[PDB]
């Protein structure tokens, strides 16, 4: 396989915006999964020449990962919060879509998506 760009973290066309909800994104909801012992599949874009998934990129066509977000987040790239929780959502939903229900990733992305939720519903207003 060869790998598609990543998705971009800089574009100077985009509005945005560093808000008091995005700031906790990265200080308290990104960097607390990111210590998770199920984090690791998620810290960077999926590497398809790397684990011989010629496949990954034929199915996800909207990649995202954290390595991603925080990039984003630390570039004031978002204009809201809600962009932010889209991408988390892209990631999880993306692991769904490629893997099958009962296997190993499934479970971690489940968990995190469930620590995530916990954490989305502890954001400031
Ligand atoms: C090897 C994994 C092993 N898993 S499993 C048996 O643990 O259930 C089945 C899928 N397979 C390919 C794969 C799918 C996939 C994915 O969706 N993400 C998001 C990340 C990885 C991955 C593998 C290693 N890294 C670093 N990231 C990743 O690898």
Redesign the pocket.
């Known amino acids: 396989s060869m790998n598609p760009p990543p998705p971009e973290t800089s574009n100077p066309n985009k509005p945005k915006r560093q808000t008091n909800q995005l700031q906790y994104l990265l200080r308290v909801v990104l960097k607390t999964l990111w210590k998770h012992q199920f984090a ?3 810290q ?1 874009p ?1 590497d398809a020449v790397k ?1 011989n ?1 010629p496949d ?1 990129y034929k199915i996800i066509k909207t990649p995202m ?1 954290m390595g991603t977000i925080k990039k984003r987040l630390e570039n004031n790239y978002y204009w809201n919060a809600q962009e932010c929780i889209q991408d988390f959502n892209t990631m999880f939903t ?2 769904y879509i ?2 099958k229900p009962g ?4 479970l971690m992305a489940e968990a995190l998506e469930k620590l995530f939720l916990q954490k989305i519903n502890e954001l400031p207003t």
């Open positions: 690791w599949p998620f960077q999926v684990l998934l990954y990962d993306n692991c490629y893997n296997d190993d990733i499934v």
